[PDB]
Amino acid sequence: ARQVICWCFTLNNPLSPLSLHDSMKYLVYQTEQGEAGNIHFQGYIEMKKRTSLAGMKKLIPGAHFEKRRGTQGEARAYSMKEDTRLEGPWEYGE
C-alpha cells in the first residue's frame, strides 16, 4: 500500500464551487475572506496517485497549485487560517 501527498492550492474569485473528481479520491476545501469583498477557496485535494498537476488544473484551470508538499500531513491539522476563515471546512468524495 502506497500513500500520496495532498495538493494545496488557492482559488481567488471563484466562478463556482468545486466538486469531487472521478480521478481523485477525496475533496477538501473551505471559503475564506480576502482580496476585496469577493471570496477565495483554500484546501487540500488528494488525487488518485500518479496524477500530475494536469489532473488538478483540469478541474480548475487558472489557479495556484503546489505539490511540493509544503504541508504533507500538516494540513490535516492547520489546514487554513481560522482568523481569516469564512466558511467550511467541507469534505466531499469517499
Phi (first) and psi of residue 74, to 5 degrees: -80, -30
| Catalytic residue from among 26, 29, 44, 78 | 78
Residue 40 among known ligand-binding residues: yes
Instruction: Please indicate whether residue 92 is annotated as part of the active site.
Output: no
93 and 24 in contact (C-beta within 8 Å)?
Answer: yes
User: Which architecture does CATH list for 1-94?
Assistant: 3-Layer(aba) Sandwich (3.40)
3-state secondary structure of 82: helix
DSSP 12-75: ES-SS-----SS-SEEEEEEEE-SSSSEEEEEEEE-SSS--HHHHHHHSTTSEEE-S-TTTTGG
Q: Which residues of 21-44 are buried (b: 16+ CB within 10 A; e: fewer)?
A: beebeebbbbbbeeeeeebbbbbb
Residue 46 among known ligand-binding residues: no
Q: Can you tell me the distance from the alpha carbon of 20 to that of 92, in angstroms, rounded to the nearest whole number? A: 6
Residue 32 among known ligand-binding residues: yes
